[PDB]
Write a protein that binds this ligand. Structure first.
Ligand SMILES: COc1ccc(CSC[C@H](NC(=O)CCCN)C(=O)NCC(=O)O)cc1
Ligand SMILES: COc1ccc(CSC[C@H](NC(=O)CCCN)C(=O)NCC(=O)O)cc1
Ligand SMILES: [Cl-]
Ligand SMILES: [Cl-]
Lengths: 221, 221
């Protein structure tokens, strides 16, 4: 069973959701960490990166770049993309909202320092008034344990990953959303996810100033 | 089955790729233009916008928001998403690179005035050195008339749409990419696309200063 190989630097960034999804699905992977700009250039010069960027995942004979292409593939392969085209639409709608919020959070430390305070406030406003109410409403609507189809899907995994990041940001933000809290708990207790959340897994820590500088070095921004 | 109904303002923006894809698929659709902040607020208040944003498309009983959710559903529904999981992986990689370049171009007029010139220069370098070479290389690899599976897919439609925007930016950018020029011609001559390119279709013009101010008042930015 040829192990997916994840090409990225040693940090969450744009590869972390893939780590979560693979782990949730019970899929053992290996990581090849990029440690320098010359490591990145070697991947490029070797023809591994369609758009000269990473993440790249070697899986099932493909060299897949673009986080959404990677995740869509994994989700479909491991039956985490719902049962039909209509369930996929709900899943897609939900996870695209999750991705918008996740992007805001991801880029927050790369924000011009003069914009950081207002943008943090905007994110917190959006969490409390836009995103968390949307997902709370979906869960309340059907009263089922999962977002879509009464069955585990990538939507549950991606939302719960985001809930962990929001907790890191401000642990109060979830406080008025009991159904999200309950989903976090249930999903975090699934054996594959529980193992991923335990010390020693490939799960990556929050990116510190230093890891961010290693990114600026490697990717030249 | 209802005719799909597209909720957006009367401009390209984030709904235009949906108009291209539906039109290319031969699917008749209706539009309901938002003209004020109040129209948008009515859709939000009445519960039809999961994340309080448009585009929203009413299709097959869903109120689908999020452009990628909308496009994924339409592509699957109309057999424009390839024939298997690995073809979808190529399609997704391709269209995610298209979206990255498209997003840059979309947001150019909303750049601070003093950053706009430098951002245009960077977009032009990326077109010439990163994106056009990637898609040229795909077309060269198989020499076929379509990007994937020797069959029209969403990737051909989204690519050709982008080639039209690039042409507006600078008609010289494609000049050294003969296979891209040929794809633009062929796809533009497909009966459905031809009709969409002709007058009187739902295709939208470039956004001018007056349309941008309309967006600023409806969406409050
Ligand atoms: C705040 O933390 C980070 C750390 C790294 C990155 C950059 S991820 C590597 C980058 N890839 C992309 O931008 C892919 C997006 C596709 N939709 C990359 O490879 N950059 C090199 C380059 O663009 O030349 C972003 C936020
Ligand atoms: C350069 O021209 C434009 C014009 C309008 C828009 C905004 S499109 C409407 C907006 N939707 C989104 O941002 C959707 C993104 C989901 N990934 C919207 O509804 N904004 C109101 C709001 O966010 O409250 C963007 C560029
Ligand atoms: Cl990516
Ligand atoms: Cl959207």
């Amino acid at each position: 069973a040829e192990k997916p190989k994840l090409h990225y630097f040693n940090a969450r960034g744009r590869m972390e959701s893939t780590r979560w999804l693979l782990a949730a699905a019970g899929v053992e992977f290996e990581e090849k960490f990029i440690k320098s700009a010359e490591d990145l250039d070697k991947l490029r010069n070797d023809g591994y990166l369609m758009f000269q960027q990473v993440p790249m995942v070697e899986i099932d004979g493909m060299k897949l770049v673009q986080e959404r292409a990677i995740l869509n593939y994994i989700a479909s392969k491991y039956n985490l993309y719902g049962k039909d085209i209509k369930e996929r639409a709900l899943i897609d709608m939900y996870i695209e909202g999750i991705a918008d919020l996740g992007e805001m959070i991801l880029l927050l430390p790369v924000c011009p320092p003069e914009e950081k305070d207002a943008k943090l406030a905007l994110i917190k406003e959006k969490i409390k008034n836009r995103y968390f109410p949307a997902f709370e409403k979906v869960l309340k609507s059907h009263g089922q344990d999962y977002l879509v189809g009464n069955k585990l899907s990538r939507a549950d995994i991606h939302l719960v990953e985001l809930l962990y990041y929001v907790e890191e940001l401000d642990s109060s933000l979830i406080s008025s959303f009991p159904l999200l809290k309950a989903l976090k708990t249930r999903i975090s207790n699934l054996p594959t996810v529980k193992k991923f959340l335990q010390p020693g897994s490939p799960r990556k820590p929050p990116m510190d100033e230093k890891s961010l500088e290693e990114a600026r070095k490697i990717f030249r921004f």
